[PDB]
Ligand binder design. Structure first.
Ligand code: MTN
Ligand code: MTN
Ligand code: MTN
Lengths: 56, 56
């Protein structure tokens, strides 16, 4: 059988902040910013640093 | 409160193939190839396409 290996890396596209009353509201704002820009992706949220990442 | 959003992308750094009796052998082979090339990362496997990915 033939098997394939893809080697992949991660790259930084961008960084932004926003003011929101809570993390849930910030997530909806950021999902809009990232997804009206058409790119559904993988989300993380770290509450200690109030930071979301999206990998799209 | 201030929230941050880091936007990430994916990069294709390489691709190889190998011939093997089964997926478990292919994985060992590919891990050797990765380790020889100082590629360290997270592994996935998609049986439908017989493709491993390693993301660094
Ligand atoms: S390069 C990362 C990657 C590999 C594959 C499984 C083909 N993918 O769908 C993505 C883009 C996640
Ligand atoms: S944006 C790609 C990326 C994700 C994370 C794991 C947060 N990183 O440290 C980098 C900047 C490599
Ligand atoms: S030999 C391929 C392999 C590597 C490691 C991650 C140590 N494994 O558990 C297997 C045997 C799948």
């Amino acid at each position: 059988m033939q098997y394939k290996l893809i080697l992949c890396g991660k790259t930084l596209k961008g960084e932004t902040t926003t003011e929101a009353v809570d993390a849930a509201t910030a997530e909806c704002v950021f999902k809009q910013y990232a997804n009206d820009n058409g790119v559904d992706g993988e989300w993380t949220y770290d509450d200690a640093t109030k930071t979301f990442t999206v990998t799209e």
